[PDB]
Design a protein around this ligand. Structure first.
Ligand SMILES: [Cl-]
Ligand SMILES: [Cl-]
Ligand SMILES: [Cl-]
Lengths: 17, 17, 17, 17, 17, 17
């Protein structure tokens, strides 16, 4: 499983950890 | 209120806590 | 890539077309 | 950068911190 | 289910059609 | 507002039309 964390600076980036 | 947490393994699952 | 499509009903379900 | 946190009570609200 | 539709302007707003 | 459109491939990419 991975957790999806969202960041932004505009484009939203969801990193799959 | 509930927080939406996202997990993945593909389908993304957003658990409403 | 795949298109990400979201549904809801609780828990959110995102599917990757 | 900002982190996107999701809350719900229905409308989903993504706060950009 | 409902379709989840996202908008942005900051804060993201997801609405459940 | 802008419409938020999501794609995936890993990392999710949300773009603001
Ligand atoms: Cl973690
Ligand atoms: Cl919590
Ligand atoms: Cl934080």
């Amino acid at each position: 499983h991975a957790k999806l964390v969202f960041f932004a600076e505009a484009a939203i980036i969801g990193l799959m950890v």
